[PDB]
Amino acid sequence: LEADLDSMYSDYTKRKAESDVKYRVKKARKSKADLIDEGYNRWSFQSKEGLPDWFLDEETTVN
Amino acid sequence: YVKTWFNQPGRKLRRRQARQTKAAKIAPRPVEAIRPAVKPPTIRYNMKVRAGRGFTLEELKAAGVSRRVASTIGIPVDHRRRNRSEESLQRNVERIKVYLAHLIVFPRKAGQPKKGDATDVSGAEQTDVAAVLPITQEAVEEAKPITEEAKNFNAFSTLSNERAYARYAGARAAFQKKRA
Amino acid sequence: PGLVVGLNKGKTLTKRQLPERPSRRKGHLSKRTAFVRSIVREVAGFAPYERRVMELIRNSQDKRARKLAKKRLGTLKRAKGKIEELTSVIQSSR
Amino acid sequence: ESNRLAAREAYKNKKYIPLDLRQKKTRAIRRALTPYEQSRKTLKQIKKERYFPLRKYALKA
Amino acid sequence: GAYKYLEELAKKKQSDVNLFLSRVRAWEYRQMNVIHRASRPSRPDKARRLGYKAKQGYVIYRIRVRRGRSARCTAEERVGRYCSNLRVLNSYWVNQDATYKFFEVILVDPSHKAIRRDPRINWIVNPVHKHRESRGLTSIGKKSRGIGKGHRFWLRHNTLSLRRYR
Amino acid sequence: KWPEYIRLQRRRKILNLRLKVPPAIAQFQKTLDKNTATQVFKLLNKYRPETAAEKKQRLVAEAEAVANGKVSKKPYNVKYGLNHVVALIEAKKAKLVLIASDVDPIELVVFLPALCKKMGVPYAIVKNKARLGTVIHQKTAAVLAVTEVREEDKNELASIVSAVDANFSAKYDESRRKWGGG
RNA sequence: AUUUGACCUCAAAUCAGGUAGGACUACGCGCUGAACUCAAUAAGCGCAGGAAAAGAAAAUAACCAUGAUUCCCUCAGUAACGGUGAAGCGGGAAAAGCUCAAAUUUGAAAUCUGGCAACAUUUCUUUUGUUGUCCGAGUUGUAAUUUCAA
RNA sequence: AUUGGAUAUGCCAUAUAAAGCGCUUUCGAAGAGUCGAGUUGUUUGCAGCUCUAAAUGGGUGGUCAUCUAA
Numbered sequence: 001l002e003a004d005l006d007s008m009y010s011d012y013t014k015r016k017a018e019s020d021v022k023y024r025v026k027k028a029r030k031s032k033a034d035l036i037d038e039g040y041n042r043w044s045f046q047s048k049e050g051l052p053d054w055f056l057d058e059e060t061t062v063n
Numbered sequence: 064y065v066k067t068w069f070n071q072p073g074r075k076l077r078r079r080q081a082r083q084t085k086a087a088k089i090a091p092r093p094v095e096a097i098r099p100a101v102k103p104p105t106i107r108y109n110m111k112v113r114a115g116r117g118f119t120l121e122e123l124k125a126a127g128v129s130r131r132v133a134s135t136i137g138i139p140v141d142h143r144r145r146n147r148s149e150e151s152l153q154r155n156v157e158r159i160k161v162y163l164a165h166l167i168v169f170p171r172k173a174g175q176p177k178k179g180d181a182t183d184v185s186g187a188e189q190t191d192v193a194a195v196l197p198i199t200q201e202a203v204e205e206a207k208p209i210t211e212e213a214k215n216f217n218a219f220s221t222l223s224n225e226r227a228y229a230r231y232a233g234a235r236a237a238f239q240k241k242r243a
Numbered sequence: 244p245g246l247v248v249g250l251n252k253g254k255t256l257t258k259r260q261l262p263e264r265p266s267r268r269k270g271h272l273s274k275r276t277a278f279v280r281s282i283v284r285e286v287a288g289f290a291p292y293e294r295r296v297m298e299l300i301r302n303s304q305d306k307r308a309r310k311l312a313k314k315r316l317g318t319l320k321r322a323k324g325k326i327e328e329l330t331s332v333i334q335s336s337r
Numbered sequence: 338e339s340n341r342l343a344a345r346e347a348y349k350n351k352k353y354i355p356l357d358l359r360q361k362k363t364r365a366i367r368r369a370l371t372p373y374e375q376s377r378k379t380l381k382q383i384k385k386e387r388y389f390p391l392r393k394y395a396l397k398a
Numbered sequence: 399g400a401y402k403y404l405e406e407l408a409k410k411k412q413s414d415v416n417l418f419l420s421r422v423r424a425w426e427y428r429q430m431n432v433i434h435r436a437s438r439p440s441r442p443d444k445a446r447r448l449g450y451k452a453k454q455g456y457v458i459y460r461i462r463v464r465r466g467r468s469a470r471c472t473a474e475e476r477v478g479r480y481c482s483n484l485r486v487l488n489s490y491w492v493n494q495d496a497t498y499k500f501f502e503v504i505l506v507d508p509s510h511k512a513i514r515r516d517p518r519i520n521w522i523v524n525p526v527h528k529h530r531e532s533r534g535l536t537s538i539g540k541k542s543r544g545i546g547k548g549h550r551f552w553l554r555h556n557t558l559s560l561r562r563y564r
Numbered sequence: 565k566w567p568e569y570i571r572l573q574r575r576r577k578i579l580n581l582r583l584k585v586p587p588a589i590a591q592f593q594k595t596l597d598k599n600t601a602t603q604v605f606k607l608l609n610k611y612r613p614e615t616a617a618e619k620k621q622r623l624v625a626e627a628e629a630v631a632n633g634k635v636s637k638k639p640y641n642v643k644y645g646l647n648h649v650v651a652l653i654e655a656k657k658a659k660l661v662l663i664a665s666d667v668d669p670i671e672l673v674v675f676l677p678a679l680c681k682k683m684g685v686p687y688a689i690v691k692n693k694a695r696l697g698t699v700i701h702q703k704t705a706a707v708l709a710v711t712e713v714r715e716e717d718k719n720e721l722a723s724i725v726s727a728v729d730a731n732f733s734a735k736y737d738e739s740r741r742k743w744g745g746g
Numbered sequence: 747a748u749u750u751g752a753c754c755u756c757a758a759a760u761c762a763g764g765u766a767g768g769a770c771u772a773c774g775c776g777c778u779g780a781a782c783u784c785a786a787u788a789a790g791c792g793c794a795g796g797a798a799a800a801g802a803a804a805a806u807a808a809c810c811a812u813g814a815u816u817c818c819c820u821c822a823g824u825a826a827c828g829g830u831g832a833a834g835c836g837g838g839a840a841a842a843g844c845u846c847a848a849a850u851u852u853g854a855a856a857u858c859u860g861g862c863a864a865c866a867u868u869u870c871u872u873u874u875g876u877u878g879u880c881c882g883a884g885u886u887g888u889a890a891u892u893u894c895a896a
Numbered sequence: 897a898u899u900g901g902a903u904a905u906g907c908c909a910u911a912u913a914a915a916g917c918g919c920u921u922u923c924g925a926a927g928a929g930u931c932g933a934g935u936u937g938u939u940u941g942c943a944g945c946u947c948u949a950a951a952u953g954g955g956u957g958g959u960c961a962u963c964u965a966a
Contacts, residue, residue, distance in 0.1 A: 317933025
């Protein structure tokens with residue numbers, strides 16, 4: 001099943017490369033230690049290690 | 064945009080008919096409920112007495128009538144107001160007591176005067192509350208004999224002192240706390 | 244003194260002790276809700292900025308810790324309210 | 338008329354009847370709440386109206 | 399009662415458990431439709447304290463709206479227009495991401511007998527409550543138009559009242 | 565291509581087994597073993613609540629007895645319902661707790677393993693809410709609790725509690741502090 | 747192997763029963779909004795009713811304290827802002843209070859829509875219900891008790 | 897010909913119950929991307945966005961007084 005999903009997503013990207021291009025969406029002391037301090041938020045823990053491409057694509061383009 | 068008042072006599076007549084219709088509908092009981100005696104909340108009007116919205120739970124309990132049946136017999140209840148002085152307490156208490164003394168309750172189901180009712184109820188008549196309970200004003204002091212210690216007492220000399228004490232209250236308030 | 248001016252200005256009457264109003268109570272900590280707050284605390288953990296405060300406090304840089312806590316929350320009273328709570332958690336963890 | 342009375346006899350005492358036989362006062366009245374379900378009250382309110390109903394009183398002048 | 403635990407957990411939105419669940423759920427609603435039926439509410443404690451009962455007549459719809467006017471008010475208006483036979487009772491935030499905020503809207507079927515015979519919700523069947531979400535009579539609607547009690551919260555000026563005797 | 569509903573059906577599963585799962589959720593997909601689960605349900609089959617027909621038969625029987633000539637035994641059954649079970653844990657009246665492993669909103673059961681451990685109540689995570697539903701004559705039961713049984717069943721009730729201890733607490737006892745998934 | 751039965755999700759039906767649209771718009775509630783303070787106006791868009799909205803204080807006050815909302819006189823053309831422009835108090839018109847979530851009925855889902863059969867009742871053969879039986883909803887919480895005035 | 901509410905009168909109901917009041921030797925659950933802060937926009941109020949609470953706590957007014965939001 002997992003291989004089938006990977007193949008389906010790869011085919012989806014292949015067709016989208018030509019047929020569904022049409023994206024174009026517009027139609028008319030404080031230091032590095034502190035930088036680490038605000039570097040931890042609700043999005044910093046959303047670890048993306050080893051995530052599948054069919055999820056990473058929408059996660060990057062949306063989240 | 065202009066607001067004209069050509070319906071002022073018409074509004075006055077309509078209100079009178081509405082009062083008349085209200086009286087006809089609920090004739091057994093007075094058309095106005097009992098209201099407590101209440102003092103306005105400002106230095107300009109604290110010398111007067113007017114009609115408050117309703118009585119409080121403490122006044123209701125002191126009078127001996129429960130907050131549940133009080134609405135039924137026609138005693139409005141205010142859950143926000145509180146009594147900060149007994150003078151207002153027994154004042155509103157005696158208003159309720161005279162109300163209850165002059166009050167007659169028709170027995171329900173017309174079978175017997177179960178506990179709190181009236182045996183003879185043929186003397187029913189619609190009368191306004193103001194006649195039985197005429198709200199009064201603050202008692203105007205009558206003539207009193209000359210007081211000797213008051214005579215020696217100057218007057219505004221004191222108001223000057225407690226004023227100066229009030230204005231510089233923080234001044235000595237600092238003085239004690241900083242030296243202690 | 245029954246006087247119009249002064250620190251006890253106004254009329255003098257017999258003062259009555261008011262009965263307790265239940266809406267004055269809100270903000271009290273019931274034992275049952277305190278227990279439930281303990282359970283969710285141990286089952287949920289702490290927010291990312293809390294973890295940074297743990298690191299800051301365990302490093303004993305309290306000035307920066309309170310400064311960033313105030314920056315995160317917005318008010319000094321909330322920042323202090325946090326600090327005492329997470330230090331209180333600190334000795335419990337220790 | 339004879340057909341419609343015949344149809345009303347056929348559908349007498351039934352939950353659903355043809356829309357022609359049903360009443361037509363207004364669309365709003367048809368969609369409104371019926372008096373039975375406007376008079377529906379919780380048991381809490383039933384107890385309140387059982388024990389503390391609007392009493393019948395009067396004042397002696 | 400477990401709703402106390404559900405409520406106290408909902409307070410901590412930066413917790414590891416809440417963050418993982420929110421991301422997975424928000425991802426799931428993404429390939430779900432913009433507006434879709436939710437057979438059971440995702441926050442039963444929030445739904446119950448907002449007025450939702452698990453009886454025939456109450457409807458839960460999930461809506462996603464992009465960020466960047468009040469999103470909660472817009473969500474209510476869109477769901478109300480999409481389900482035209484339903485009265486919008488209330489709504490509540492469930493999830494968010496970088497660009498999409500997710501809301502669940504509680505609706506009531508005024509035509510259902512389980513609603514028409516319930517005295518605790520019968521008020522919504524009256525015609526005065528048609529499209530409350532559009533007239534601004536919901537919780538977020540009232541808050542958005544500034545209806546409140548206090549000094550903090552027009553026609554009396556633009557008119558010059560001329561009495562009979564003057 | 566498969567419909568979008570079944571695509572999302574498979575995609576949700578793969579992600580749930582793919583992402584880094586916090587321990588509070590990771591403790592759920594580790595459940596009770598087979599034979600213990602069968603013995604659990606064998607015991608609960610005896611103490612399933614009476615059906616609606618049985619309740620009605622009892623009610624009419626006692627009603628006619630009172631009407632004609634005239635109080636029953638102590639009921640023995642499993643306790644269901646999330647709030648009722650949580651109350652029993654609070655009052656320590658429950659002896660065994662069973663939690664379905666696949667509750668749709670997981671926050672409804674995420675706090676239970678911590679709560680039973682705080683009260684020292686033997687708890688276990690069993691497979692599927694449907695099986696609990698058939699036990700209590702329902703479609704769905706998010707949690708079951710055994711608080712009282714008959715005297716002859718006390719002996720094997722202690723035995724299964726020991727068995728679930730061995731296979732759920734003596735075994736594992738680390739997934740609640742292990743970063744699951746991934 | 748694989749057959750059998752559950753639960754979850756999602757479909758399809760000229761399935762059974764319902765509901766939404768459109769029109770009027772003087773008054774009512776919102777969104778939006780110019781130009782010559784103009785004006786939160788006109789225009790545009792959405793949505794109701796016989797009234798609408800608001801409404802039982804996360805309210806005023808600094809008093810011997812007031813006590814839901816709405817409207818009128820007054821405050822007052824005052825405070826305030828840079829010509830705009832209140833509100834508290836006071837006097838009246840009218841008055842009415844309440845309902846949920848948050849706690850176990852656990853010796854018993856006591857709750858509810860629908861199907862079927864009778865019994866009825868009607869502004870009415872056109873309306874609205876009652877009981878019995880079945881299925882379903884529902885323990886991811888329907889009933890009763892509680893809403894801080896407690 | 898309708899009704900609206902009461903009065904007199906008849907018949908059913910089922911109270912083995914429910915409710916009000918004084919005491920506590922008791923506990924008293926109370927609404928979260930919500931309050932709040934920074935920033936931009938509209939005429940304090942509202943909205944967008946960064947961030948994000950507490951449980952005698954929170955809001956409002958000058959330690960006190962008054963309210964108990966989401």
